[PDB]
Write a structure and sequence with these properties.
This is part of a larger assembly, with chains A (71 residues), B (177 residues) and C (116 residues).
Chain A: E1 16-17, E2 22-25, E3 32-33, E4 44-46, E5 51-58, E6 63-69
Chain B: H1 4-19, E1 33-36, H2 46-59, E2 65-67, E3 85-90, H3 93-106, E4 127-129, E5 152-155, H4 162-171
Antiparallel strand pairs in B: 1-3, 1-5, 2-3, 4-5
Chain C: H1 3-20, E1 24-29, E2 34-39, E3 46-51, H2 55-58, H3 67-84, E4 90-91, H4 101-111
Parallel strand pairs in C: 1-4
Antiparallel strand pairs in C: 1-2, 2-3
Helix pairs in contact in C: 3-4
The chains are: A mainly beta (71), B alpha+beta (177), C alpha+beta (116).
Chain B binds three RNA strands through β1, β2, β3, α3 and β4.
RNA sequence: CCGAUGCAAACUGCGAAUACCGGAGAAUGUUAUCACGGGAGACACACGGCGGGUGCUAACGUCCGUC
RNA sequence: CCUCCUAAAGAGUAACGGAGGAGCACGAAGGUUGGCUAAUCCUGGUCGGACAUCAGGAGGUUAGUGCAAUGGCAUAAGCCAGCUUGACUGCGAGCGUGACGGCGCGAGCAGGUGCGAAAGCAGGUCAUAGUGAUCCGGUGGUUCUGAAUGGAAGGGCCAUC
RNA sequence: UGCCUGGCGGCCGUAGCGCGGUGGUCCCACCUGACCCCAUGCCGAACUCAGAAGUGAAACGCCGUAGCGCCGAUGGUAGUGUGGGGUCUCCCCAUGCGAGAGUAGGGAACUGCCAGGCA
């Protein structure tokens, strides 16, 4: 018988993000951290070093990993 | 050990002669005998279960572990996590001695000894049976009997068909049905 | 299921060590033989591998698999790593238990003077 | 309820155009871009096209996103 | 204050729009090591037949993970045994948003801890709601200052009911 | 440099599911007892101690089986940005981008390094 929250990917592939930048703040884990990418308590992927952002599918389950390569 | 030598000497030889395999251990082997109770009457009293568990520990060489309930249904008035039964697992010398002691003295003395029930199989080779009057076993005496309880003994069979289980049961001549 | 469970359990540390990208020392223990490999961060090349099956170190060993054989493999790996310049690789137990031959091999490797 | 056939705003084993972010590039555009400072104005908008909600899927009825 | 749509595959975008729940809880349901990890269904059991329990199998995350609801979750973010309190103090590059008050994530440094052989982990709880700003009143520290001097009354900031 | 076996990565159904056959030279697996290092929320259940005493039972390596499953064209089809038109609730015209599914076709995977037996 509220206020929308901000979701989705903030930094896409090819962006030369800085260390600590939040690539994606999602509900749970839509994508998994790979190389030089962390995972916060709230399941937030944040960059660890300067470089370009890439998304790659790997693993038997075909899960997408967010990774950072040298700039 | 004590009975495995005679097993390999005679039972394996007879079964090999009967079935004409190639591998020496092609005859399926028993791993463990699981001692269990289908009493299902300890719901009201926990002391009954405690005494039965003490009896199981006394008869066997090791004490049992209390097992909790799996599901809760309102129709049968059962909650989740309710401790009702327990099991004992044996594998090795303890099992060999238990089987020898059973098949030597305990099996013959059964009231209404019309034979075993070969039809009571799992359909894949395992044979599980349950009989009352645990008093028959010698480890339990008449002066220390609380109530009549049923048993549940399931022999382990690695075969893929019931013919191998039938042969293994007949190994001890399977007195009759 | 034994091999699958072992591999699944080892995969935890196997992936954990990959984030920091350091050379890893893994040990595969079998009653017949024991093997110890040093794997680069890439994961496709091994800097140095030692095995009990080869006769280079099995001549003085009565049997290929035992505590003495594990110690010999550990010391051989340690000396080879010293002369190669591994620079303090990390260690992995491959999902085994660090109480028996694995512990003996680790102690033998650390005896040479390693800092892992 | 067993299998099959059609169907959907709090249905997708697949999946467009369009929109959004970033990188590289010829051409054009009076820098049209960004930052700071002075000064503002305005704070009941109307109508029409495009795709929907609402409405009795009757209304030159009603509200939305774009132009 | 949170759980999906109308909302036209970035975010956002309507009418007491369609929908409920939290306004808690765990001081253990926190951290660390080892190992384990189904649900469901066929079949045997004194009744058990699936439905009060156990073991031989099909099946691999449909069970669960404290909640109304939601995503992702078997290297389970579960579930047995172990040891403790990192739910510690000063902090903190960068990032996500906001009109502000601010909120959240966060690499990493200094002190000293628990789990470990080490690698390393721990700045509370799998997460999204679960709370209180301003003013006022209660307590501890500070001579920081004190209307001549030394005190004191009264103020200023630190913890905080 | 060829066959076979294990370990470490990429690839994640062209790696999978079902069926028949082959592997003890080496390697791998089944296991005895554990009073000894270690332990069971009971069980030597799992890990640890001594191998060929026997074997390839089961798992696993390989060949065929295209039966199931997977990928996968060209083309067409639906859709759609832009400008216009009509009988304007809906459709069409010129242009650009282009579905899913299925068909042809493939495949019973491939590749990098180390170790060991036979050549």
């Amino acid at each position: 018988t509220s206020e929308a929250k901000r979701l989705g990917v903030k930094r896409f592939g090819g962006e030369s993000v800085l260390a600590g930048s939040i690539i994606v703040r999602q509900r749970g884990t839509k994508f998994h951290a790979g190389a030089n990418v962390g995972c916060g308590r709230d399941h937030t992927l944040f960059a660890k070093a300067d470089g370009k952002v890439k998304f790659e599918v790997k693993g038997p389950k075909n899960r997408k990993f967010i990774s950072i390569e040298a700039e | 050990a004590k009975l495995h030598d005679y097993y390999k000497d005679e039972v394996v030889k007879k079964l090999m002669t009967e079935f004409n395999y190639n591998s020496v251990m092609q005859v399926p082997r028993v791993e463990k005998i699981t001692l269990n109770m289908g009493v299902g009457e300890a719901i009201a009293d926990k002391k009954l279960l405690d005494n039965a568990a003490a009896d199981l520990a006394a008869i066997s060489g090791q004490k049992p572990l209390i097992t909790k309930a799996r599901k809760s249904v309102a129709g049968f008035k059962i909650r989740q996590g309710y401790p009702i039964g327990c099991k004992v697992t044996l594998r090795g010398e303890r099992m060999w001695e238990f089987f020898e002691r059973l098949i030597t003295i305990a099996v013959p003395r059964i009231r209404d000894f019309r034979g075993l029930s070969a039809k009571s199989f799992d359909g894949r080779g395992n044979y599980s049976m349950g009989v009352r009057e645990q008093i028959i076993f010698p480890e339990i005496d008449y002066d220390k009997v609380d109530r009549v309880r049923g048993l549940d003994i399931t022999i382990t069979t690695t075969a893929k068909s019931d013919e191998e289980g039938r042969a293994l049961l007949a190994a001890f001549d399977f007195p009759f049905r | 299921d034994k091999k699958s469970a072992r591999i699944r359990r080892a995969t935890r540390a196997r992936r954990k060590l990959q984030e920091l990208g350091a050379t890893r020392l893994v040990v595969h223990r079998t009653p017949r033989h024991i093997y110890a490999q040093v794997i680069a961060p890439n994961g496709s090349e091994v800097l140095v591998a030692a095995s009990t099956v080869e006769k280079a170190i099995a001549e003085q060993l009565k049997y290929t698999g035992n505590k003495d054989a594990a110690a010999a493999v550990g010391k051989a790996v340690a000396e080879r790593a010293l002369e190669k310049g591994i620079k303090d690789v990390s260690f992995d137990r491959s999902g085994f238990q660090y109480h028996g031959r694995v512990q003996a091999l680790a102690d033998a490797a650390r005896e040479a003077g390693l800092q892992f």
